[PDB]
Symmetry: D2
Subunit: 296 residues, 4 copies
């Protein structure tokens, strides 16, 4: 199977006067490339996929593909939906814009059955010929892609090559790689990046890497090269920022950090997302002061 692994970044989508800041988006993606990042995830959950239009979805996938062109950096485009017909459309569309693969979240809100999840993802995989990475985040979706459903999908469809897990369940991460050791388990939970990698995980799709791309990539590459003592050291010193970046729902804290670090120009969200509490604003700024934040 063709795969997309390593240190990956769920990119924020900077706004300026209600529109996508196409200059900051490109500037931010070349900052990721210059710090050892292996792939970028445009218009994911961290990029406020829910409040973006279809034309903004296309623009940012295109900017990612073009900014990475020539580099070894891959583009793993966010293309998911709780409607199967729409998920297939978004997958085909992503391929037409030059993405190397798609990240497809489990259908949210409507809670499909395990059988339905299989048929949902099977249709998506047969629409395109590019890698498909599943995204399991039950706290947000209200549903769980079971270990047997993930493995069945991995074995039955070529392009499904693994799953990005955000479930805080290291038991499940042992379960997966013990019954199907060939899949690519990707951490979608920054705080436990090292434990997932040390059990055979082959990458992360990180939120913290928006602010500290150099540290997240070093952590990932240390682990893949089996230097677990140096990988754990970075994971240990990243814990404080890893937790405070979720003091409120992602991506509210990370955009606050990016704005405070001067990497984005305005602290703008699209409703129902908004600026954080005054207390958490100070707590994010305080925790930031103990990390050296790479510039442009």
């Amino acid at each position: 199977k063709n795969i997309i692994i390593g240190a990956m970044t769920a990119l924020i989508t900077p706004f300026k006067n209600g529109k996508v800041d196409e200059q900051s988006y490109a500037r931010l993606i070349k900052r990721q490339i210059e710090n050892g990042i292996d792939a970028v995830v445009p218009v994911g959950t961290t990029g406020e996929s829910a409040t973006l239009t279809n034309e903004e979805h296309r623009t940012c996938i295109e900017i990612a593909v073009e900014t990475c062109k020539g580099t070894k950096v891959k583009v793993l485009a966010g293309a998911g939906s709780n409607a199967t017909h729409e998920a297939v459309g978004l997958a085909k569309f992503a391929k037409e814009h030059g993405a190397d693969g798609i990240l497809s979240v489990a259908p949210y809100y409507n809670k499909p059955t395990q059988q339905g999840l299989y048929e949902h993802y099977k249709a998506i995989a047969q629409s395109v010929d590019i890698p498909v990475l599943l995204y399991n985040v039950p706290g947000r979706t209200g549903c769980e892609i079971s270990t047997d459903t993930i493995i069945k999908l991995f074995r039955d469809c070529e392009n499904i090559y693994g799953v990005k897990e955000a479930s805080g369940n290291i038991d499940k991460c042992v379960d997966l790689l013990a019954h199907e050791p060939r899949m690519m388990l990707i951490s979608g939970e920054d705080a436990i990046n090292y434990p997932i990698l040390s059990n055979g995980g082959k990458g992360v799709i990180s939120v913290t890497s928006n602010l500290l791309p150099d540290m997240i990539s070093a952590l990932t590459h240390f682990a893949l090269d089996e230097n677990y003592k140096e990988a754990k050291k970075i994971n240990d010193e990243l814990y404080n920022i890893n937790k405070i970046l979720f003091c409120e729902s992602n991506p509210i804290p990370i955009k606050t950090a990016m704005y405070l670090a001067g990497l984005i120009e305005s602290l703008e969200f699209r409703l129902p997302l908004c600026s954080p509490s005054k207390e958490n604003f100070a707590k994010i700024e305080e925790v930031m002061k103990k990390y050296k934040i790479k510039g442009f």
Copy 2:
């Protein structure tokens, strides 16, 4: 305040050859009207809002508005979204096409803060001049509208008149009606319809009423007239069907039941929703046999 209360039905949306069966949809809505139902809810979660197009969304709202014309039955249209801009658009659209009010579910998947939930619903409320009923279902949305947020919204925007609760939290319903007894608490959980009504709840938005509208109608009005013994007897008698109508994700069991009762011609869902088990199919069929299901 303008209100929409009483016995209400979250309508299923029947499909035939992948398209909305517009003639059964109208026939089903007139079956609700003829059995004492006070309002119907088109294109809600039970109506598979997620897999419907904008043009079908409008079609089923129009069919609902058109068939309740001349009757006393109100149309509480489903118009919610995890994007405020679309939720405002969907709300304005419902009013322009004759809906009497909107049911607006809490933003799903994206997890807005309580502050963000306030600004989200405030934008929807200021967009229209028809009643707006909040919908809290944390198991599906991943977020919870706190009691203080609901009460703040009820007091700050007048078209917001209450909340539909599917939370399995009778403590919260005591909390709500003890600190703000003027709001309209609506039961969104058929099994606990009576406890919610007996604490001051003023209506239900039911799933069971799709199959047994006469029984749910009697329950609601018995309770509203404070005949609790006669209301509770129906609630106790409906418990068995109330539970198994959720043996799989709603609306998988109720559509199965409607098909088994012969009220729709095809047992079709749109992926990622699917037909249930062969075993869940048989236990839905068994429990149905202990109830009298009115025909057309």
Copy 3:
């Protein structure tokens, strides 16, 4: 079946210089009797069952039996354990000292199966000839007595006449009384006393009644005679004190309230229970000011 229903109080156990204040204990039970309480629960969870010795267990049961001598107030003695052979000893023993019935908590910590729970309670019921009330509170024990396990015990064992539910699950309270309407459902959660009573519950085992015994008894008997509007009015007015009495683990808040009201002489617990935070201390003093606390 012999039953013990109505308004009941989970008695606190006042300490003085590390010993049980035996005269205050009697005085406190006499304040309950004079304010319409129907039964008292010595050596329960609210009475710090865990940190009392067997001889203090006996002393407090005997003081309760002696103080209710001549009155119509029943003694529902706490006699539970997660070791069956000891739970049987405590049940036999409670009867030998004049208790009218026993409240038996579900085995904690060791998490028995439903089969194990069945055999546990069957042994206790066959050990004595006084009414046995099961006590289900999964948040404290780590296990749940299922609806079918409760009903099987009610039908198979003569002495078992109901359950005291502290599970925040009004669905389960519909489940119980719809499939077995002859059992005595007792509310073990003060905030939802009225909803449980309005569904057929026949009494409460209260914590707040330690502070406001007259108000809890008025609520109970209003509800039992069916004046539900009068019962709900008291339950709505009691919500604030009912919640703030659990800002920390029971009985830490209630003992603080009893001390502030001057009903007990010293704010003593046995470790690992301790005095509350400074902030929670102030919050209890706030809420008490909105209620009339009957003296001696």
Copy 4:
């Protein structure tokens, strides 16, 4: 600090005709010693701590002390309670009988506050001069020892040297060892033994080692020797048996496994524990079939 780390076994307690099979106990403890175990834990939760008497508590600790005479294998005796005065007593007695250290479970059922938990363990630590290991298992106790409480106890009392964690929370184990890298984190969840060890944990207190002591010992020592390829290899192969050993409450599956393997002589529990369902009984024997169970 003096510590007790490495591969450890939470010993089952075999019964024969309602009595502790003392002879069989010693034979099983010497089977653990002969297979690389570094310490054994008598009368813990796996040993049915709740249903043993105080003198049976003494009997099983003493046999352990006597059977480890002459070996390097330590005795980490279970001596815990939800009553602090009893927890101090059980610790003193455990030391007076020759134990090398204490395992002290968090107070169950009575849910002490974080402040109360600190004073609880401080009393136990100041009671004895042998190592004290904290035990956090919130699913059974109903309480959680916060990370800050664990760290405060580690720094404030000499003999408190770490915590055993059974919380299914790999985030918390990063939290602990990143803010206090000097403590001894011990895994109390067999399925995630390696991830906890791979993050700096220095031992396990196992259930599986009752059945497969050589495999659990090899896993730990490989991990302690930083041979992470071989530690994960064993952990991946043990996942199936590790999970099926909790299809019912521990120690119901492990005692069933020991009986099926012929390592214990009768399948007896003390109520409320009992033999498993036939269905789960068959599932345990099946999963056992892919492992080599060392004899005596």
